[PDB]
Amino acid sequence: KILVIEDDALLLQGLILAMQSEGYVCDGVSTAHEAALSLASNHYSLIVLDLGLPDEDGLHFLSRMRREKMTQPVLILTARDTLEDRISGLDTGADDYLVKPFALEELNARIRALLRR
């Protein structure tokens, strides 16, 4: 089960379809707030996390998740593309960091890598 957190609706819907195509169960949410509601009500094996979100920055939310001792693999998937952004994302507790625009099949391969580990 994958949770995708992404505020662009068109992109989010396509990401859900992609995860389902890969044989995962997938829930998509558009805010950090909705993510917290979903994390409380369901168990996820991996989280895909956009950083630019309307209510709380994804990086701040990730910090909170790790402070709550959540250990799910997190892949950051974001338009924030600077070297500083990538390093801070990883050091905040992300397991991978993939910049937009990106190919769907690379996302799939990186999710496979994260999961078999």
Which parts of 8-67 interact with ligand BEF (CB under 6 A)?
50-52
Cα 45 to Cα 73: distance, rounded to the nearest angstrom: 7
Q: Give the per-residue contact string, 41-60, with Mg ion (x = CB under 5 A; - = no).
A: ---------x-x--------
Reading the block at residue 55, the tokens are 């209510």
Q: Give the per-residue contact string, 31-70, with a second copy (x = CB under 8 A; - = no).
A: ----------------------------------------
Q: Which stretch binds a second copy (CB under 8 A): 4-12, 33-41, 45-53, 87-95?
A: 87-95
Q: Which stretch binds a second copy (CB under 8 A): 6-14, 25-33, 51-59, 79-87?
A: 79-87
Q: Which stretch binds a second copy (CB under 8 A): 26-34, 36-44, 49-57, 108-116?
A: 108-116
Reading the block at residue 63, the tokens are 């910090």
Order the strands of the 2-5 sheet from edge to edge: 26-29, 2-5, 46-49, 74-78, 96-99
